């Protein structure tokens, strides 16, 4: 799983209230949890099995005739044109996102909250309670510092260390 020591290929670590994950640079897309690559714009015979989005690949569709479609990888479902774990299909979190939980005997979806929010036991553990989260990211010394932006922690460049 993604930890503070995890290296993200062409990406960077970010932190929410309950997990860490890699976020891609520029306009790249995730092919797995720790690797970002360039997306293809059109699915066809030349781009089969290449990424076309976060956890999505171009799939050869056998038929009369053969066609090509961009579909989510195994274990993911497309919800509002975004691939998410199947166990997160009907999870509503509010000020957060649903992630896969593997601590119970069966796979479950749990809410991981934006920085500043925590699961609310009085609201089905949704992200509707204010709480503090300490940044655990290990940023570059003298050049970077951990800051919260758009609800996540990430290593930001200090003033003058551009």
């Amino acid at each position, epitope marked *: 799983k993604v930890t503070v020591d995890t290296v993200c290929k062409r990406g960077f670590l970010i932190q929410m209230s309950g997990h860490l994950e890699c976020k891609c640079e520029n306009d790249l897309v995730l092919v797995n949890e720790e690797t970002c690559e360039e997306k293809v714009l059109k699915c066809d015979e030349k781009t089969v099995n290449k990424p076309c989005g976060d956890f999505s690949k171009c*799939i*050869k*569709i*056998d*038929g*009369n*005739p053969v*066609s090509y*479609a961009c*579909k*989510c990888n195994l274990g*993911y*479902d*497309m*919800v509002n*044109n975004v691939c998410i774990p*199947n166990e997160c*299909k*009907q999870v509503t979190c509010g000020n957060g996102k649903c992630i896969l939980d593997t601590s119970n005997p069966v796979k479950t979806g749990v809410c991981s909250c934006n920085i500043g929010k925590v699961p609310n036991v009085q609201d089905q553990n949704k992200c509707s309670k204010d709480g503090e989260t300490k940044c655990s990211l290990k940023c570059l010394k003298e050049q970077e510092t951990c800051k919260a932006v758009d609800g996540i922690y990430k290593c930001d460049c200090k003033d003058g260390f551009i």
Partner: single-chain antibody, 236 residues
């Protein structure tokens, strides 16, 4: 695992409406095209409508054009079929069918719900076939020369049950995709315009109606066609 359960069937008078549902469980609902297929008493399969995995396209059969509407509420993982201006011609068992992740084959079928309304050729199969226990039988499905390179799907419908997917066979006799729970006694072959489903060491449980089907996606229009069905009788 994969499950499709239909609901909403019943008796309706000609001219009125009826909405069918299909609750899906066991798979990524957004990664599969979903279809409705109907079967009138004593007849073969008849494709009704299809909706795209992401929801970009909806296609319908000419017999239901302007009267039926397919929908999916991606959240609830439910497939709908709205039927207006019903006719006695619409009396049939309606199955919701799921397409495979990487092919047009209908690899999973519901058990069906009954609706009773009361107050160029692509594919061809012989109507019947027979064989003795333990023998071998080859079922034939013949294409038109204009579609000589088409792949066809085979489906098995046990008596009193709904269909299930067996195998898709293309030119060269290549297994393009195979259904779940199919015994090794089942195989496929091809020769020119013909596609074959073969069964060795025939059992009493092989007594079924076998249906040939194929998708046809020319231009920006989609259509799934079915043969008449070959009813197989096992002697002994």
């Amino acid at each position: 695992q994969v499950q499709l359960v239909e609901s909403g069937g019943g008796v309706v008078q000609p001219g009125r409406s009826l909405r069918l549902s299909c609750a899906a469980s066991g798979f990524s609902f957004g990664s599969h095209d979903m279809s409705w297929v109907r079967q009138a008493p004593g007849k073969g399969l008849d494709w009704v409508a299809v909706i795209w995995y992401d929801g970009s396209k909806k296609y319908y059969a000419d017999s239901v054009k302007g009267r039926f509407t397919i929908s999916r509420d991606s959240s609830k993982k439910t497939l709908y079929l709205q039927m207006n201006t019903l006719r006695a011609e619409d009396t049939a068992v309606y199955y919701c069918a799921r397409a495979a992740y990487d092919s047009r084959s209908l690899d999973y079928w519901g058990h069906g719900t009954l609706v009773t309304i009361s107050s160029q050729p692509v594919l061809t199969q012989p109507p019947s076939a027979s064989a003795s226990l333990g023998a071998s039988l080859s079922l034939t499905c013949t294409l038109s020369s204009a579609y000589s390179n088409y792949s066809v799907d085979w489906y098995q419908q046990r008596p009193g049950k709904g269909p299930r997917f067996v195998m898709r066979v293309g030119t060269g006799g290549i297994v393009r995709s195979k259904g779940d729970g199919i015994p090794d006694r089942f195989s496929v072959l091809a020769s020119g315009l013909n596609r074959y489903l073969t069964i060795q060491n025939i059992q009493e449980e092989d007594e079924s109606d076998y249906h040939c089907g194929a998708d046809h996606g020319s231009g920006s229009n989609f259509l799934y066609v079915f043969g008449t069905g070959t009813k197989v009788t096992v002697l002994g």
